[PDB]
Amino acid sequence: SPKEILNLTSELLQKCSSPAKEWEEYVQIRTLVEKIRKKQKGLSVTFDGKREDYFPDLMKWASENGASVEGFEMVNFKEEGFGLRATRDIKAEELFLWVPRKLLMTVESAKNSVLGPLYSQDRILQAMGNIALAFHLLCERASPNSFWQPYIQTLPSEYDTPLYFEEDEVRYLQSTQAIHDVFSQYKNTARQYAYFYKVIHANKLPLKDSFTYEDYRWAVSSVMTRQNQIPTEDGSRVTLALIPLWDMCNHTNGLITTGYNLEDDRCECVALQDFRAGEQIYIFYGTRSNAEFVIHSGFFFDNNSHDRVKIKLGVSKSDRLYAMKAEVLARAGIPTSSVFALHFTEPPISAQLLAFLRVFCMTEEELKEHLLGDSAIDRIFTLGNSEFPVSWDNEVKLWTFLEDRASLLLKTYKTTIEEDKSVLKNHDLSVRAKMAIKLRLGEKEILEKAVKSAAVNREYYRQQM
Ligand SMILES: C[S@@+](CC[C@H](N)C(=O)[O-])C[C@H]1O[C@@H](n2cnc3c(N)ncnc32)[C@H](O)[C@@H]1O
Numbered sequence: 001s002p003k004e005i006l007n008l009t010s011e012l013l014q015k016c017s018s019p020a021k022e023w024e025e026y027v028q029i030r031t032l033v034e035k036i037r038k039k040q041k042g043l044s045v046t047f048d049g050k051r052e053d054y055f056p057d058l059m060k061w062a063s064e065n066g067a068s069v070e071g072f073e074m075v076n077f078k079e080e081g082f083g084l085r086a087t088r089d090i091k092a093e094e095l096f097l098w099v100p101r102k103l104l105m106t107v108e109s110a111k112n113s114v115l116g117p118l119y120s121q122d123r124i125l126q127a128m129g130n131i132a133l134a135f136h137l138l139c140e141r142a143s144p145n146s147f148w149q150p151y152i153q154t155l156p157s158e159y160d161t162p163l164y165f166e167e168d169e170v171r172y173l174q175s176t177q178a179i180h181d182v183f184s185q186y187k188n189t190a191r192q193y194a195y196f197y198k199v200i201h202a203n204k205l206p207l208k209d210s211f212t213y214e215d216y217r218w219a220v221s222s223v224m225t226r227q228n229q230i231p232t233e234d235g236s237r238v239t240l241a242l243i244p245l246w247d248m249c250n251h252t253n254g255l256i257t258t259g260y261n262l263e264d265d266r267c268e269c270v271a272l273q274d275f276r277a278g279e280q281i282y283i284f285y286g287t288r289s290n291a292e293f294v295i296h297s298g299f300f301f302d303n304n305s306h307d308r309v310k311i312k313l314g315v316s317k318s319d320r321l322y323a324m325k326a327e328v329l330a331r332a333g334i335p336t337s338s339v340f341a342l343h344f345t346e347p348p349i350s351a352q353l354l355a356f357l358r359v360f361c362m363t364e365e366e367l368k369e370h371l372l373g374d375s376a377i378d379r380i381f382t383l384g385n386s387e388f389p390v391s392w393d394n395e396v397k398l399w400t401f402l403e404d405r406a407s408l409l410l411k412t413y414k415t416t417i418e419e420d421k422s423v424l425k426n427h428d429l430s431v432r433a434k435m436a437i438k439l440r441l442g443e444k445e446i447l448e449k450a451v452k453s454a455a456v457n458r459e460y461y462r463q464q465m
């Protein structure tokens, strides 16, 4: 049994160290992982009660270490799972939550823990603070007298990140942009488990006794769905942390502000609106897309204002004007090839993508004028500015290119928008399956809206004198 585990581990490391069809490669590492997982005992450490039985002990511990515990409670919400609910009215500008640095789990708490000796010797742990935090969480989970036990015992036992999807759930993402990041996440997590199973030279860790794949998947998913950035002890730069109490807050586009109080050395949340008793207390996780939310947080946000789909574009080395185009882009601080995004909102493109498309479609004479800088206007500075077109001709060409490109990308999809919406009527679809389908539907709705915006712009510029 232990010799067999290490044998399958070595094969997993090799299988995940070769680059790449993508789906075929994914099912291979998936059948390999599900085999190693079958031979293991799930999570090495489990707790006697359900997570909700442990919330009073999390509150007591946070309270004893100086955190704000009054005016809220933990409630199981239908749409977001567990979260915080106000027990009284909260007024705008009220400093509602504060969590002292002592409660946090950081790379700094990791280095000072039983994990320090292995952290000091391992190069992978040194370059990836999130993986180091994942291991710090694992080591402490398995230490019964750990200071962080009231926090670890209230953490979820599973997540809705793609690492937890069944093959049939991921299948729904075939022929989408998002599926590429899902494969990469699966291939990197498996590679990481393999490397670290072999490495696990500090044997004083409770991971020497038991370190399953389910342990690693739980640790990295706990970190990616909950990690927040905090400043360092001196305030020089940003670092990652797991913040107890605070990380019970779900996401909404709400009237709250979060920050770090350097002087009092604590994580702070200020209400920017009055909240009524019995209302859920949320925080803003950031202007993340639904792809970033599904893949790194395990949820799809329906009311996402910031939804977008990734798009790769580059100037062709076979274009006669490649060198001039590349130079104008470099002077504007834009690469010759990169991953851009198409936004659901009007305008679908950023100042950086507008700048790129204008250069991509410039004539030789326009390129020369930009490189000479003999305009009364700094044309490099206004390159991504909608108010300063290079020419109506350039605008017509770039909006034509975008319309055509988005139309082409749309055809690469296996299902229609109506088919996605019909599928979504199945009340028995799993949470994970609904997330994959909404994501697939979302990509198409963004591309369809981008075709329409590009046509409106093409028409507008073809109407100019
Ligand atoms: C930082 S924790 C928030 C507390 C989490 N609900 C729990 O029970 O521990 C983040 C997790 O909450 C969920 N979540 C947060 N906001 C959400 C939302 N608006 N809709 C659905 N799920 C949400 C996802 O499972 C996410 O991975």
Ligand SMILES: [As]
Binding pocket: 228, 229, 230, 258, 259, 260, 266, 267, 268
């Ligand atoms: As904070």
Ligand SMILES: [As]
Binding pocket: 096, 097, 256, 269, 270, 271, 281, 282
């Ligand atoms: As708050």
